[PDB]
Design a protein around this ligand. Sequence first.
Ligand SMILES: [K+]
Ligand code: NA
Ligand code: NA
Length: 68
Amino acid sequence: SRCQGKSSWPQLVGSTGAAAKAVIERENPRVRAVIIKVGSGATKDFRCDRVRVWVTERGIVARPPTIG
Ligand SMILES: [K+]
Ligand code: NA
Ligand code: NA
């Protein structure tokens, strides 16, 4: 019965990746946030325990973090 809880963090765009990771992982204890640079690619599968945090070259969140 996975994927419950908060599952998207639209207000974290524009935040730093580190700030975002901590907010995500505090608000939903069933996920781990993964910082990844925009354009670098990540597996195209679906996981309820993962939140990709897509960041610019300066480490700013550039897409709304969502479970998947
Ligand atoms: K914001
Ligand atoms: Na949010
Ligand atoms: Na994700």
